[PDB]
Ligand binder design. Structure first.
Ligand SMILES: CCN1C(=O)c2cccc3c(S(=O)(=O)N4CCC[C@H](O)C4)ccc1c23
Length: 127
């Protein structure tokens, strides 16, 4: 049983930007989702060993989680907001791939994803 290396959160050769939308995504969107009662399963990479889900990383080849996204934001890892939004979408999509409609984990993702879409519907305009 082995978890893979988690996604990178630092990369000096990546071009980085401190964007008004990216600050919003950390200060407002991520930190609001982070406090939700259903956020805890998404706050770190899936530990397929602890959770005894040995087939998780057989199926999920681009893992993502809100703890990785929080580190990426706090270390100024993104060039623009769409890169950060795509990591959220990967995280939600992975959960819907590995799991089935009706699963408790999928009810949690569906709630988080609707809040997430509410919060990003309006981003501060690129000043
Ligand atoms: C989001 C990443 N991710 C999955 O794809 C997934 C599949 C099955 C279980 C599980 C758990 S759990 O065992 O802690 N638990 C959490 C609360 C609701 C259910 O009871 C399951 C935590 C995080 C998970 C899973």
């Amino acid at each position: 049983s082995m978890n893979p290396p988690p996604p990178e959160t630092s990369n000096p050769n990546k071009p980085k930007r401190q964007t008004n939308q990216l600050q919003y995504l950390l200060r407002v969107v991520l930190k609001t989702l982070w406090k939700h009662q259903f956020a805890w399963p998404f706050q770190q990479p899936v530990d397929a060993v602890k959770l005894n889900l040995p087939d998780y990383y057989k199926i999920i080849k681009t893992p993502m989680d809100m703890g990785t996204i929080k580190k990426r934001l706090e270390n100024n890892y993104y060039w623009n907001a769409q890169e950060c939004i795509q990591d959220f979408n990967t995280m939600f999509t992975n959960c819907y791939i590995y799991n089935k409609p009706g699963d408790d984990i999928v009810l949690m993702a569906e709630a988080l994803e609707k809040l997430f879409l509410q919060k990003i519907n309006e981003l501060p305009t690129e000043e």
